[PDB]
Amino acid sequence: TSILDIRQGPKEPFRDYVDRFYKTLRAEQASQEVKNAATETLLVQNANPDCKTILKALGPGATLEEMMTACQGVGGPGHKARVL
């Protein structure tokens, strides 16, 4: 029931992971240093390595949309497609 259990699952998307992270966070919102602590930092730290790199490239305070966008980018991406 800890935040440690909140990790970036394989078949599980980043959305479900975030939900879990915030689920546990709001399950025992507390810490020896919540202020000094950085949820986003925990999610990233408790997030896969690749995602970690993507987050590292992102910025020290990326938006949720940016975080999930980068996570979604993880692995063989696919979106862009059109002709000019």
Side-chain angles (χ1 to χ4, degrees):
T1 209
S2 200
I3 314 275
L4 73 106
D5 220 299
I6 293 55
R7 223 193 144 67
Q8 253 158 30
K11 176 150 193 273
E12 177 214 38
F14 182 69
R15 261 169 120 88
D16 273 35
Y17 167 52
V18 155
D19 199 40
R20 230 297 140 69
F21 185 94
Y22 281 51
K23 258 160 174 280
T24 293
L25 103 66
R26 253 199 280 186
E28 203 156 342
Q29 219 319 283
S31 210
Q32 187 157 60
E33 245 155 271
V34 178
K35 246 169 129 219
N36 269 92
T39 42
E40 166 275 351
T41 221
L42 256 173
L43 177 104
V44 175
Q45 277 188 357
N46 206 345
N48 243 12
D50 230 89
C51 191
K52 199 201 164 189
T53 297
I54 323 219
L55 294 145
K56 267 163 148 280
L58 245 90
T63 257
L64 242 116
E65 281 201 83
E66 207 68 75
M67 282 190 284
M68 82 88 172
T69 273
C71 199
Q72 234 285 104
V74 89
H79 208 301
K80 195 162 237 137
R82 64 166 125 190
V83 172
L84 187 114

